[PDB]
């Protein structure tokens, strides 16, 4: 199966980082997470582990081609920009980088403050 000019989605929480390679149609091709690379704890939240899972998604994406990538970065956590430098390391032409961030204008109220 052959598709080109895919879209890379990056979801970065405070505890885990999930990377997914899709098409313009919004269909899953390859997903890879920080916990699947075998860190599982305080090591899980590091921006180093957002490079291990980033390239591993970039290796099952060459099953279908995808010589062009379009990056949407989403999340507050660390490894927010370290994952982009681990994309063209596999040899992918990155066209444009775009922030997507859910910001409520007023929104529902968040949980209470820790003590």
């Amino acid at each position: 199966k052959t598709v080109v000019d895919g879209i890379a989605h990056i979801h970065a929480s405070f505890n885990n980082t999930i990377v997914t390679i899709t098409d313009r149609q919004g269909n899953a091709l390859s997903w890879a997470t920080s916990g699947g690379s075998g860190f599982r704890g305080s090591r899980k939240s590091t921006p180093f582990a957002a490079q291990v899972a980033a390239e591993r998604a970039g290796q099952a994406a060459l099953e279908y081609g995808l010589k062009n990538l379009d990056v949407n970065v989403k999340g507050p956590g660390p490894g927010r920009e370290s994952a982009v430098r681990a994309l063209n390391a596999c040899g992918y032409k990155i066209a444009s980088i775009t922030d997507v961030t859910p910001i409520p204008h007023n929104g529902c109220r968040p949980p209470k403050k820790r003590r």
Partner: protein
């Protein structure tokens, strides 16, 4: 939004354009609800830290 030409240039044009827009400190203040009295402490302490900064700099401007 950052388009592209080496790659290290477009990174620093993106790390900076996100911060110069915002939406990184605002996310960090969505994870605990402040009661409106505690939001009147930011309005109180920051107004003191601005009017005192206009006067402490005048000692440097002597």
């Amino acid at each position: 939004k950052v388009k592209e030409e080496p790659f290290d240039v477009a990174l620093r044009r993106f790390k900076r354009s996100c911060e110069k827009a915002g939406a990184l400190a605002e996310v960090r203040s969505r994870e605990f609800y402040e009661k409106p009295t505690a939001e009147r402490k930011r309005k109180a302490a920051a107004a003191v830290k601005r009017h005192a900064k206009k006067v402490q700099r005048e000692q440097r401007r002597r």
